[PDB]
Design a binder for this molecule. Structure first.
Ligand SMILES: Cc1ncc(COP(=O)(O)O)c(CN[C@@H](C)C(=O)O)c1O
Ligand SMILES: Cc1ncc(COP(=O)(O)O)c(CN[C@@H](C)C(=O)O)c1O
Ligand SMILES: Cc1ncc(COP(=O)(O)O)c(CN[C@@H](C)C(=O)O)c1O
Ligand SMILES: Cc1ncc(COP(=O)(O)O)c(CN[C@@H](C)C(=O)O)c1O
Ligand SMILES: N[C@@H](CCCC[NH3+])C(=O)O
Ligand SMILES: N[C@@H](CCCC[NH3+])C(=O)O
Ligand SMILES: N[C@@H](CCCC[NH3+])C(=O)O
Ligand SMILES: N[C@@H](CCCC[NH3+])C(=O)O
Lengths: 393, 393, 392, 392
């Protein structure tokens, strides 16, 4: 939006939270003190509605972040979690019961899949899978006991973009009361306005772009009015919360999210365009790159891109080639996570990807390189990638 | 132990964590960088064994705390959680599946009960209850599908102490492979060496005495070798972790835990002795006070007391009397939680207690006052309590 | 071509990061010596990045110090509780009874007050110069002039020095004088002071380095000639910063390039728009043509930040000042700058005259200082336009 | 009867805590004024606890300042990056060219070095006195003596002043002199300096107030006569502490009483045991009978902390120093003190002589300084006994 940067700078900032400073105060607390029985009664009644009650419900610092997330993502409430994986697992758990069925994209984050197959399965909840490009044909997979439809767009690692309008419309035709969820981390919740598309809950690893500096972990889940109270109370029954200081740092990260994302978009698309012309590259998976799976949906449904994408090499690198390649970069660092200022590089063997694509078939045989494009000078990053190519030519 | 204070000062402090300082470093991270493919392979193999892999598994700061908790509580591993309630809920969840049965003391922390009745019940796991003084007679409640026996000693609010040796021995006779758990928060994990008694897992709201200052929330679960790997991996599948700074503050709280607990013991027992002689007091629930329920077990099985206890007034105070009493204390603060330097006061109506004692009957009709005795001068606290009594005489 | 890469990587060595992207936070007073020989080695190297005592620093400070030295091209970086402490203690480190300080009359007011209220009673005199004096500063250098203190752009009124002409003139008369600059507006990276022959570059890292209005810290990066005296005399005054703020300063560096580019783009737009506005008499922005010293900014800087000022076409009454300043929707009234929030402050001409020693001001309208943050510039323009309508 | 209650409650008002037990942490440079009138009011009250600018403080600092004033009985509390900064800047706030400072020759070495290496070149002279001089200090007061600087117990050698006799003597000759004390060993609460007619009580809050060896901060609590000058001259040098360390200092206060009682009990036991040991020539513990000034400690203090020293029955060789110090299991070799960890340091007699201006030392054995932490005292005794066996 033409006002997103203004919204990012101001979200969640009310005087009761900031008390004269630009940023919210950091209120560290378990105990929250009631001056009177009447104040305790009021706090108890409103213990889930932004009145100070107990640290597990939140302090002023959490309330400020929650207000900011609800403004930016257009929700009725925002639940907070110790990390992105906890947000996914506990948001699903909040809405299933024995006998229910979960329908999840087979490009979902691997720990999200493992939560379903290793935790939910033993509790009486089953999981089916769908191709990210299934579109309207997802109506054929919905069962009488299907309670949750779980999206992730772009998909993890391989970056396939859903046709969310087609998927949502099909779901609402067959099972209108289904809970549609999305892991919206890649878009940082702001490049894809999930709730505006009829999705019920938008989950983020705020660990990534919201924190923005690779030094804090936190999950968020913003729900519409229909689903908020069940999410809030069931997640609370699991004790899910984040510490006040990380909440403060997430609010703080919001303030620069627009400037950062614009640079990640510009730099990563430039890199992807170069890779797509490169003799040692077989495929480029960047939602903003014409030709990538689901690109047309990204162009239609997103307001921008972030900096995480991947590409396929011309070959399945051996262990020895992978070391020659990855061990000798000067700028890219080998690490998990993404969304920070540091450019990162991560390799996945085609067979490794096949193993996390349930009931699907991988359509590449070269090693998949996932890049996070950070804030470095893009020409320096290209030179680093070029040196890597020369080590394996 | 005659060396507990020395152990508390030194636990978890190895050079790889402290790097020259007295306290561990604070390493804030999601991304942890691998210098080489060989280093990444080593990190992956040992990602649950204290090698840096990914922030969700921990940084140096978490590893230091985990080592400290395992030393002090005599366990094989320590899982970390965003708060005490999350530790309880996810430690139980890590070991049950559809069709299992949980046997829990009916004096358990109310959110622990609610996790069982509102979350587990809809996932196919049932919960039965037992009186805290059931002792060896608990063998009669164990069912072929009973997987978890959940203790809490002293109990929440009413402070009844289990006969843990009797309970454990009975459980091992009937269902030797049962997972015995205890919420050991009141003892701060160190006044009752749960694992030495044959309990499998010792859970704490480190929020309380370990943090020690009412300004940080965190849960811990220390497991023996038999149960560690299931606890660790299933809790991780739920995304459970704590932030690095709170881990640092928990290690830091350990260093003064002995001096603090000795003062909480001395002051709270003095207060309890006075209350037990008081014309406006009907009953005193302090494990260290002769006559309290389970006291003989506390004397035999614990190495000390903390500062949390409760007493029963001569009457069920009306709302108006409760305000006259609680609104006008000068030192005691009305708040939830405990284990800090501030003395706290909290009232529970006898009928409120009855409502959180499933399949049991309350044996008092006066208002129950729970006190946390902090680090204030004990005579000032007695004067505050005396003024309170005069307001309701 | 490379500043953004340098900002991302500065100060990051494994001994400081230990596996993470950012340096570890090592909170410490006591630092433990395993042996007498280790203690002797730490003592010898207590100003050279071996752990010795928290007042000298921990790994977190060492990482920031290395980053600042790399980015500003210096031999060492002293750390301070705030920018004002960096200014006061850096000057103090190089003067003694009988010395003379020559300071631009556009210096930050607390810097001036340090000179007139602290240094003077300790036997150090201060004289003043117009910021556009250029080579004619040679005529003001006295036999006892020890420090020449620059600030470019100047505080509030934003005049840009001709640093090459000033430095050449100083070195002709007093080759060994200590030339210092408060380089906060450039965040130490838009103007590479040490490459111009300045000896010490001082920053309120509070501003753009922290970048979020929520941490205070001063830095002073010195060349090889001046470092040891700066380091040891600041240490004798106990000057340090806490490890956590040091960490947050290193962390701020990483986004400094992308932030500054936005502040530049937006503040230049606003300045160009104000320059055309009928209710504006003059715009003081280093990057705007016609502003005092603009030609030196264009020649000597690699960019602009977001702080500047303008003069209204009239002197506002007290009622008009309240109507104007009390009713902005986005601009906040506050001191400091360099964050994501846009800020506004007002000064009457006589207020500025009072902090322009031996000079008069050349305007009569109310002066407005703006910090242009990261909001959408069109929203900021609409906020300013609404303000103009309240005083028209 | 009430210190523990005071420590738990000091500085805690709803405007600072806003519902929590501890004060909020307000990180800020910029503090926002909603209106011109609010800005005027904040400006008027910028040293009196109205939010104005982060260099003056936020709510977190105000809470700590109120706590320190309540606990030490003062009119205001200035905050500094560390103890050495508090000492240096508190002295500097009250001197000018031509003044004379009279300091105990047992002062902390960096305090002495500030005087001889910074003040001297700024026209301020420093003279010295034996810590047991008592009323005879009157003979050392010069017409230009402005500051009398006490430290009781003394650094390392632990001599306790007769503060009533010193203060009475000073006030007879120079009633308006500024009497200051470095009151770190007493943590400001075991010796209520301002009640004895001292004007300013300075602490390295780094030590027992923080209490965990992981934060650095200085404080100076002044009476009504001296506060404004302290406050404003320290502010002109930019002296402040970050909000987070201020929070951690308030937090440390809450356990200070229970910690100090353990440090007292354990360090007195160790001192009594060392005094009986055949390899110990002398024990310097304020609470131990026979120690220099013990009678004044017993009369004037309400307790002891855990730092003291002793003299070995011989001068250790370099080989014996390594054998002794390199092989402790619990005691760590490090600077600072006041935490939960027990610490050990050694000094030869000539090292102490070098920091005893105009005095000679009266011992020839190696001096060992111990900080007694929170470990089990019998384990610490076993550690010390093993050390004795390594040098016997
Ligand atoms: C899409 C997505 N969802 C959830 C998560 C989990 O968030 P936390 O790491 O905060 O629990 C991640 C992190 N995946 C990282 C580790 C990666 O792709 O390397 C993710 O990429
Ligand atoms: C025994 C016990 N277990 C678990 C918890 C939950 O820990 P967290 O609050 O960190 O989630 C509490 C806190 N009960 C507090 C709130 C009380 O008794 O007031 C507790 O007392
Ligand atoms: C140019 C300049 N130098 C130094 C400082 C002092 O830094 P600290 O505030 O960290 O001590 C400031 C702060 N000026 C703010 C207050 C302003 O211009 O409003 C400044 O603008
Ligand atoms: C008495 C005394 N005053 C002031 C200070 C200075 O405090 P900072 O270290 O916070 O600047 C110290 C520190 N003395 C430590 C270093 C010691 O005696 O080893 C001290 O012991
Ligand atoms: N009034 C808001 C700030 C408004 C910000 C305008 N940019 C607060 O008190 O936090
Ligand atoms: N060697 C340990 C400290 C030993 C502490 C003895 N009290 C470390 O490096 O952290
Ligand atoms: N080797 C450096 C990191 C290099 C960063 C490359 N972008 C460290 O250990 O911190
Ligand atoms: N009223 C105080 C707390 C009183 C504390 C009583 N022990 C506050 O709001 O912080």
């Amino acid at each position: 939006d033409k006002h997103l940067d203004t919204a990012l700078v101001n979200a969640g900032r009310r005087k009761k939270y900031t008390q004269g400073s630009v940023n919210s105060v950091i209120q560290r607390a378990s105990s929250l003190v009631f001056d009177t029985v009447e104040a305790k009664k009021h706090a108890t009644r409103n213990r889930a509605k932004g009145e100070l009650f107990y640290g597990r419900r939140g302090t002023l610092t959490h309330f400020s972040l929650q207000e900011a997330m609800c403004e930016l993502e257009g929700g009725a409430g925002c639940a907070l979690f110790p990390c992105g994986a906890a947000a996914v697992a506990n948001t699903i758990l909040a809405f299933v019961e024995q006998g229910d069925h979960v329908l999840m994209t087979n490009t979902a984050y691997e720990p999200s899949q493992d939560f379903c197959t290793k935790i939910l399965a033993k509790l009486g909840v089953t999981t089916g899978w769908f191709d990210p490009l299934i579109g309207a044909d997802i109506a054929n997979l919905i069962q009488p006991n299907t309670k949750v439809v779980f999206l992730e767009s772009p998909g993890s690692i391989t970056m396939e973009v859903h046709d969310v309008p087609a998927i949502v419309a099909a779901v609402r035709r067959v099972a209108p009361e289904a809970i549609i969820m999305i892991d919206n981390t890649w878009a940082a919740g702001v490049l894809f306005k999930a709730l505006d598309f009829g999705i019920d809950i938008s989950i983020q690893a705020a660990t990534k772009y919201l924190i923005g500096h690779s030094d804090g972990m936190i999950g968020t889940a913003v729900a519409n009015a229909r689903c908020w109270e069940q999410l809030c109370e069931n997640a609370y029954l699991m004790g899910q919360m984040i510490d006040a200081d990380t909440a403060y740092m997430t609010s703080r990260g919001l303030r620069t999210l627009g400037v950062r994302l614009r640079q990640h978009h510009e730099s990563s698309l430039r890199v992807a365009e170069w890779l797509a012309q490169h003799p040692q590259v077989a495929r480029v998976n960047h939602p903003a790159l014409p030709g990538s799976k689901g690109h047309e949906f990204w162009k239609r449904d997103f307001s921008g891109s972030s900096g995480l994408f991947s590409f396929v090499l011309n070959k399945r690198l051996t262990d020895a080639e992978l070391a020659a390649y990855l061990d000798n970069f000067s700028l890219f660092s080998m690490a998990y996570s993404w969304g920070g200022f540091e450019s990162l590089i991560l390799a996945n063997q085609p067979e490794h990807i096949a193993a996390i694509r349930p009931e699907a078939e991988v359509d590449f045989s070269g090693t998949l390189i996932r890049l996070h494009i950070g804030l470095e000078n893009v020409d320096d990053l290209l030179a680093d990638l070029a040196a890597g190519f020369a080590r394996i030519v």
